[PDB]
Design a protein around this ligand. Structure first.
Ligand SMILES: CCCCCCCCCCCCO[C@@H]1O[C@H](CO)[C@@H](O[C@H]2O[C@H](CO)[C@@H](O)[C@H](O)[C@H]2O)[C@H](O)[C@H]1O
Ligand SMILES: CCCCCCCCCCCCO[C@@H]1O[C@H](CO)[C@@H](O[C@H]2O[C@H](CO)[C@@H](O)[C@H](O)[C@H]2O)[C@H](O)[C@H]1O
Ligand SMILES: CCCCCCCCCCCCO[C@@H]1O[C@H](CO)[C@@H](O[C@H]2O[C@H](CO)[C@@H](O)[C@H](O)[C@H]2O)[C@H](O)[C@H]1O
Ligand SMILES: *Cc1nc(C*)nc(C*)n1
Lengths: 559, 16, 150
């Protein structure tokens, strides 16, 4: 086709930026866009190319941005070979014939400081790493086999060492007519490779046959499950690690372990005539017993096992860590209770869940390095709770809290209250808290020792959006950190929508980095002007929704 | 690793 | 005034139904089929000649992963994951009733164990579908309440 209408902006990182997009309708179900983006501080034109396509394999979008030379980057890195910057992005997803599944999520940048300097369309300055994943899968009603590759480019210059699966094959098989029992089998073959040439490399082969007997009534349910876990590890390039650590990794490792889990739920109902005529209240208790014997996993390097968050839903999870490198022993009982309140039309209006985990014996993975605030090992250690209340068709409220006895404090908490008359007219308040003890426990040591990490999280966010005269839309957002008493994100936006065009003016002041010299955060102020031509589509919205997604902390509908 | 005498199907702590 | 639930979770009219989706082998369809089989519901093929049977069509599934909170340097700390699922339950005589499910999850980010975090994210997704399935089942009675009134 032809040229699009240009847009512009002023930022504190690039001064005046001018965009000159050009559309290119190459054919049906595939088009392209070429954008010269002139930046004045760097004094050069970033050539951006976008390619959107549809095909039998699915739908995909590619992006390639290239800046041949940079002035700020040249000044900051005088000994660098070249100052060119580039970005490659590819997002593809498709299902062919209902059985073949293709997924691609690939992002690559020249340097870790790319997203702090340029616009955030497929990336962001809040991202800590870039993901490069390919996956091809074959799925039928009782079978699925997926082969995928995962690589990660880490931006933080603390430790660039990372692990990648190249490749990882997962196989799942099911059979639900083996007498009264339901059986399934899971298998995996993974190759772990590290970017550094001195880190260990591994090959893991895992098998997991599980058999479960479910039983149900109109008022109760009970499911028993027995599973076996067989894992074989082949580890190489482990001379360097063994040379400095007392704990020695083994080349060939075999880990065989059973697991027994019994879950049960009850449902009680009553007609809450005291509060409202015809309203129903359901009290659902739930219990679970989990037993997995200890296995010394100190001679297996941790490649993809990390501690998992324990919300109310996560209290009944059968695993403490993701992946399969660390499998903590367990002799525990989880007990929870959920109360729901339905109106006359059988529509759920209120729910509140509270649960806890009781440990009969300590959960040991063989290699215990977590730094807790106390030496509590057995007893009611983990408590979780959540609530969701629909006060009306416009008011909604959500909340969640997680308390851990070993931290001697509330581990995490979050809350939000939203009013929403329509897509355009809305207000929302939210709060997020993560204690410093939780940050120290479930993160690296330099997180605990860093000034920008050790304070934890205490963030209060306000969002508002209102239309005026059926043609103007005003959107505002303000996220503020109570610990430092400093703003984290701030955004304003005004859009005027007409019959054939829409004019949008936006402004955002956001946290953008850290100044190690003076030890204070860096803020990036941007203000952009963008006009778009209407009339070619039935879209007559006021633009509030995509304006609310512009900032680094995008709006999410909590109903 | 493991021990001198261990059972693959054990159900006990140290593969007893 | 408490008492045990004397009625089944799925309504008696929807005991035998048809599960139709555009991704029958997808994780959401598998989770919904497993949840329906848990409640003693008999699922038929979409080509079934039996009439007057309610039909549940699963709509688009959207998964978003945004940043909820950030550190003092602007790096993300908490990732909030949102799952939105839509479906329509058609009673062939009466009408089509739309239902939807929203699942909220969150997890902390750690670049140094980033691959492990990705595995955790996958596990979270494998949880969320199941939760969404339960939510859809929990709106099965209300549709019945929407049918008797008309
Ligand atoms: C679905 C809900 C019902 C599930 C079934 C009931 C589960 C609870 C019983 C688990 C059996 C294990 O036994 C339960 O835990 C430990 C052993 O593990 C016992 O504890 C005993 O042995 C342990 C050894 O581990 C000693 O450290 C402890 O000092 C001693 O009291 C508890 O006294 C008992 O309550
Ligand atoms: C339905 C079950 C309950 C969950 C429902 C949702 C309710 C919770 C959401 C609101 C969160 C309030 O947050 C809760 O109070 C404050 C922060 O506000 C923190 O409380 C803090 O108080 C003081 C002063 O800062 C500190 O010395 C203390 O150590 C710390 O705990 C809690 O650790 C946090 O958990
Ligand atoms: C829910 C309501 C949402 C709307 C409210 C949020 C939008 C209002 C703007 C708040 C942010 C403005 O930021 C506030 O003022 C100016 C910028 O204006 C910042 O100060 C800045 O000034 C200029 C930009 O003009 C920069 O060159 C300078 O380096 C910087 O200090 C202050 O340090 C901050 O206190
Ligand atoms: C490594 C190992 N070896 C044996 C014999 N048994 C177990 C459970 N584990």
């Amino acid at each position: 086709s032809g040229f699009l209408i240009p847009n512009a902006k002023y930022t504190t990182t690039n001064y005046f930026e001018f965009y000159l997009p050009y559309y290119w309708n190459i054919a049906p179900n595939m088009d392209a866009t070429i954008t010269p983006h002139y930046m004045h501080r760097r004094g050069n034109i970033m050539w951006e190319n976008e390619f959107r396509y549809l095909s039998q394999a699915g739908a995909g979008l590619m992006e390639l941005d290239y800046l041949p030379s940079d002035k700020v980057y040249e000044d900051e890195h005088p000994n660098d070979d070249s100052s060119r910057r580039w970005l490659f992005y590819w997002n593809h997803s498709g299902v062919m014939d209902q059985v073949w599944r293709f997924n691609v999520d690939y992002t690559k940048v020249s340097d870790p400081s790319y997203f702090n300097d340029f616009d955030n369309k497929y990336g962001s300055s809040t991202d800590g790493y870039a993901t490069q994943k390919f996956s091809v899968g074959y799925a039928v009603q009782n079978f699925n086999a997926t082969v995928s590759t995962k690589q990660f480019q880490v931006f933080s210059e603390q430790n660039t060492s990372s692990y990648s699966a190249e490749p990882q094959l997962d196989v799942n098989y099911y059979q639900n007519d083996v007498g009264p029992f339901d059986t399934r089998i899971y298998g995996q073959a993974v190759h772990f490779v590290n970017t550094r040439d001195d880190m260990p490399e591994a090959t893991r082969v895992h098998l997991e046959p599980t058999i479960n007997l479910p039983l149900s009534n109109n008022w109760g349910s009970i499911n028993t499950e027995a599973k076996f876990l067989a894992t074989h590890y082949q580890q190489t390039n482990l001379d360097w690690y063994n040379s400095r650590n007392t704990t020695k990794l083994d080349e060939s490792v075999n880990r065989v372990m059973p697991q027994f889990k019994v879950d049960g739920k009850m449902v009680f109902e009553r007609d809450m005539e005291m509060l409202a005529p015809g309203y129903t209240q359901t009290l659902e208790p739930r219990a679970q017993y989990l037993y997995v014997p200890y296995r010394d996993q100190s001679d297996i390097y941790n490649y993809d096992s990390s501690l998992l968050q324990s919300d109310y839903s996560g209290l009944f999870r059968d695993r403490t860590y993701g992946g399969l490198d660390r499998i903590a022993s367990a002799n525990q009982v989880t007990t929870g209770v959920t109360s729901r309140i339905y109106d006359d039309a059988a529509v759920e209006r209120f729910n509140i869940s509270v649960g806890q985990i009781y440990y009969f014996t300590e959960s040991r993975t063989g290699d215990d390095n977590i730094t807790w605030e106390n030496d509590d090992k057995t007893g009611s250690l983990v408590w979780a709770g959540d609530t969701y209340w629909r006060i009306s068709e416009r008011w909604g409220l959500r909340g969640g809290i997680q308390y851990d006895t070993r931290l001697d404090n509330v581990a995490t908490s979050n809350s939000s209250i939203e009013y929403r008359r329509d897509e355009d007219r809305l207000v929302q308040l939210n709060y997020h808290y993560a204690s410093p003890e939780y940050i120290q426990a479930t993160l690296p040591k330099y997180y605990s020792t860093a000034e920008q990490y050790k304070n934890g999280i205490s963030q209060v966010g306000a969002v508002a959006s209102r239309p005026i005269a059926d043609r103007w839309s005003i959107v505002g957002a303000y996220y503020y950190d109570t610990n430092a008493n400093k703003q984290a994100d701030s955004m304003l936006g005004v859009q005027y929508s007409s019959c054939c065009y829409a004019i949008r003016v936006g402004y955002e002041r956001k946290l953008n980095g850290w100044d190690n010299d003076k030890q204070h955060a860096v803020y990036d102020n941007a203000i952009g002007f963008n006009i778009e031509l209407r009339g070619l589509s039935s879209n007559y919205g006021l633009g509030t929704q995509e304006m609310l997604r512009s900032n680094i902390l995008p709006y999410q509908n909590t109903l | 690793a493991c021990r001198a005498k261990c059972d693959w199907f054990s159900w006990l702590d140290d593969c007893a | 005034g408490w008492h045990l639930r004397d009625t089944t979770q799925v309504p008696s009219t929807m005991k035998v139904m048809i599960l139709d989706s555009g991704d029958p082998n997808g994780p959401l369809s598998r989770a919904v089929r497993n949840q329906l089989r848990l409640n003693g519901v008999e699922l038929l093929d979409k080509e079934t000649t039996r009439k007057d049977v309610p039909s549940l069509r699963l709509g688009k599934v959207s998964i978003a992963k945004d940043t909820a909170s950030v550190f003092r340097n602007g790096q993300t700390a908490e990732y909030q994951m949102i799952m939105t699922v839509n479906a329509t339950v058609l009673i062939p005589g009466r009408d089509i009733y739309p239902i939807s499910a929203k699942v909220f999850r969150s997890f902390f980010d750690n670049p140094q164990m980033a691959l492990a975090k990705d595995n955790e994210q996958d596990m979270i997704v494998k949880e969320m579908y199941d939760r969404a399935a339960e939510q859809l089942i929990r709106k099965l009675p209300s549709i019945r309440a929407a049918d008797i009134r008309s």
